[PDB]
Amino acid sequence: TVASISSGPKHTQKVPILTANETGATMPVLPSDSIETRTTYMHFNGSETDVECFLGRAACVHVTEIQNKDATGIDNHREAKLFNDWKISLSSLVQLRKKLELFTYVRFDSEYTILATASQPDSANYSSNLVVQAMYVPPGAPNPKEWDDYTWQSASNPSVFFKVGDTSRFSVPYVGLASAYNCFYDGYSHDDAETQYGITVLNHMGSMAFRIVNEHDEHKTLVKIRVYHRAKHVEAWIPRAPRALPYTSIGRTNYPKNTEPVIKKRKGDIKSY
Amino acid sequence: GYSDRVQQITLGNSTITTQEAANAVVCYAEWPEYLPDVDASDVNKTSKPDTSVCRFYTLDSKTWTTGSKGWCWKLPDALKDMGVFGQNMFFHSLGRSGYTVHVQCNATKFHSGCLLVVVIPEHQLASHEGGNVSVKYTFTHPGERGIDLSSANEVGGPVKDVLYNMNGTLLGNLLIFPHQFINLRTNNTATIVIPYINSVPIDSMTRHNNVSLMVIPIAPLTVPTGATPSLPITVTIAPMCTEFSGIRSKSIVPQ
Amino acid sequence: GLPTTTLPGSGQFLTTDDRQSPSALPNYEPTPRIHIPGKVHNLLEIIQVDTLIPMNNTHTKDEVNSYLIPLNANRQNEQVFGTNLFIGDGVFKTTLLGEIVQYYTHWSGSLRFSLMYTGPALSSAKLILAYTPPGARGPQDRREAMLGTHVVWDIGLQSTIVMTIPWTSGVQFRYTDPDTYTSAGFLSCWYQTSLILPPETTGQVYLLSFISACPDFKLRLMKDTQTISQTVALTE
Amino acid sequence: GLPTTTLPGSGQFLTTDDRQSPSALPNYEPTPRIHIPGKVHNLLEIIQVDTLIPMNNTHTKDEVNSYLIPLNANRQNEQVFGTNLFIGDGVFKTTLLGEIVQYYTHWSGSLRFSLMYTGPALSSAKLILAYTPPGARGPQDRREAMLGTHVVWDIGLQSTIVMTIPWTSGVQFRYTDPDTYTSAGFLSCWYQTSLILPPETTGQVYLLSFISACPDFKLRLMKDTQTISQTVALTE
Amino acid sequence: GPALSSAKLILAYTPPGARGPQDRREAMLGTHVVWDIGLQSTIVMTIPWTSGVQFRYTD
Amino acid sequence: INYYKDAASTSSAGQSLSMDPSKFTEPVKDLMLKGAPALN
Amino acid sequence: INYYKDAASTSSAGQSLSMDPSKFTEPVKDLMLKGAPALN
Ligand SMILES: Cc1cc(CCCCCOc2ccc(C3=NCCO3)cc2)on1
């Protein structure tokens, strides 16, 4: 492939460099339209800018935490982090978010990796290997109430059991209701006067719930869960302007008030170098 | 003697002529078309009013003055009240449509000024409150009036800050969306053909707007000496290939 | 039972590796795809669309005005604007090009810089745009500027001029984050003759300026952008 | 010894994975199969059999009577019953259809709603059943109702009427657990003319109503049902 | 008008059955042409025959 | 070799090697030739 | 590839792709045609 062809002096009536940008086109002008060039080859394919590659590496999408401790006398397991959940979503952590929102609709399979590490803040003894249970709780399923409810039987709901310190990995097909996931949605769930506006209404994907299977030892053990997400089989439509201001909320476009100028002011003139 | 410059668009029972055009943009290089069976889901036969809905509606005019910040209309909202297009809209459960948008602004060879005319698929607005305040329905359904970016923040309304496109992105990059400029010195109209763009084959016309049309002054209007300091901008829009499905009782929407 | 040996790296999680995994939802059938206009395949497809450069960066809070390069009637010989070419920083940084370049470590290729004139139709002007390849200072006067890559632009019916910064380089890749060894030059613009307004007209006229990449362009070695960060996880 | 590397996920137990295992009972011979009528292969086979809907839900303890929709002689213009179409909740919820839908997250397809009349043979009646697609309110009077999907039913020799709620939807799947965006409409029924009883006869007559899915139907993404739970393990 | 002026007018034909339009919004919903004043000096609008009965009276 | 039955479980996809910027860079209705005048 | 000798040790079975609701939806002795009267 040639990156530049050889081109010499020109004295024409045919001027490729004068255009009318009002038309909305970006005319494909090249170095050889306005200087004299020599042949050179590309030596490159643009492999690593493919959208599959761009969205295809694992990104941290969520960090939560649960603890193993005596539940005796706990009136609210959920509240003691005896188990915890996560209202699945991919917009909470914002590094991966800016990348996805370069597109309007996106379609992909997900590969999740879950790393779980333990911490023993209060001076301790022997730690017996804890086994985490991650179970997917889709919309309209008995949400779990204690850390050892019938829910955890999970007879119809996919769940994975792995050890703290290890990693769990599995992959979920594209579960969207439509043909693509909306990265943006300028609509409502119905024409009410006070119903929420955005996507949050659209990406009702239910939540994920974690717990330790082990009963309690004499000390307490903090287990912190990190969920990583990798898109595989990516398809993206309609590019948009990149995010300039900071994010404030999952699912709304809102930016913070009295934010700071995002364009760097010159130290000098327009004329400055 | 054909110029890129003169054009005629006849759609239904209405025709537009421009003698000072700058080509026309067809979003994503695709022209509006009906919904193919292979893509269909709802089993209902759809209704295609054709020429009674696919004609040109001219919205009320705006006034560009030296202080203007820009205006924003949403589709199909802007047309919610135009003739039979609008009736069909409130009466069917689902509908689908593409449009021809023609924005008009003429001046003289002594004026200067340049407007950006852009179509943004799925333009989800931001609340000026920050945090996770929502933007109430009425605020994103201004109707033919559209939203005036130089109007004041209101409560439950969107933010109207132009350098941020009403969503946290910079004005400068709106050029990645199908758009055309109106530069008084060149141009006097802008025309964009919009194919139907959605993640579902057909949708509700009232709970979801699928494009915002935005006209933004970028190089300020400058009139000749002792000229009146303003020009009107007119927007005429025509639904094209419209289909409605799931007819019934007639939606009632807030406000 | 087949005998195996495990190598160094067993059990590691590399966020960039690409392997098979069990599906949690065995046998599930995804929604059919329908057609949607606009599919993107390569980021190289989109960085060829031009977007506006806030060249007039001299303000103090972001404003529509930093996109406008002003022009003065009747000045002769003088300089319209100047900038270095660190596409990952400074004026370029918020543009779509600048914004994507920042997802990669290295770039190579030609850039296309165009200027669209917005003055009254009955005015006229001749400007010179000059690209100064690495190795010399930003030009200080047109004489200096005109000895490097340049285009005399004659403002006419055809409203925009497209200047190309041809890839001039020893090393075949440069860093997107500004680096010296790897630096690309300067871009300046001067009156060639001068802007002239018709009667009954007055004041400043402005140029809009765009930037996009030529088909020439290469970007490689993905990394994280300095353009976005956060202090606590967001919530709904 | 062949060199290997283990990946992330090694040692995990995913309740949904499908692999081989050693048999604990090597060489055991299972009992021969004999023929048994009734084999089921897909849950889609059984949700097409219709079952009764406790439409008359207005009681206070479960009774045979909530399966009976009453009809009054001589009323004109008035409304016989109304319900939304959240097949995973409310009247539908205990029906076989409702009961299976609850094992899945998403459903799509047409529903078949039929009414069998049980009044004396010498009586007569004309009813209108109306389906109101998402987007409008439950109809408030027949005029409103008759502008959407409807069937005038004439009570005759043929005892049942089968109304179909054709799949009317933007999005190709809806949630089985009630959700707004995803909501399906309303179903109402009104006197078209009115029930008329023969002489020597009196009182209320009832309609029985059934629900089953059309062959159209799709259910996907299995999950756990809210319809059953427990607090301690059972024993013998 | 002078050659250096400019204007955009809408001409509308309203078929029998409605009143003479009272504002452009009303006018623009019937047969109409947006005329852009340019180099080409004249605009030709056609009142297409819209009628139930195939002849009308001249009086 | 896929070891698993479902398609979601396969590795990353392989390069589009599609690449056609014209839907974004030249969505004009009447074709523009480089070198010919922009506005005729 | 089965690594094990016994049939119980193989993975899950593969979709019936049988599907015939008529034993449940139309177990009538004399065949009913849709469109013809139910009771003659
Ligand atoms: C946009 C957008 C895209 C996504 C991701 C959707 C992923 C589908 C649901 O995700 C899961 C997560 C975990 C499990 C799981 N099953 C057993 C253990 O974890 C299943 C599906 O979220 N928002």
From Swiss-Prot, chain E:
It comes from the Viruses. It is found in: Virion; Host cytoplasm. Transmembrane segments: none annotated. Signal peptide: none annotated. Forms an icosahedral capsid of pseudo T=3 symmetry with capsid proteins VP2 and VP3. The capsid is 300 Angstroms in diameter, composed of 60 copies of each capsid protein and enclosing the viral positive strand RNA genome. Interacts with capsid protein VP0 and capsid protein VP1 to form heterotrimeric protomers. Five protomers subsequently associate to form pentamers which serve as building blocks for the capsid. Interacts with capsid protein VP4 in the mature capsid. Interacts with protein 2C; this interaction may be important for virion morphogenesis. This is Capsid protein VP3. It comes from Human rhinovirus 14 (HRV-14). The lineage of its organism: Viruses, Riboviria, Orthornavirae, Pisuviricota, Pisoniviricetes.
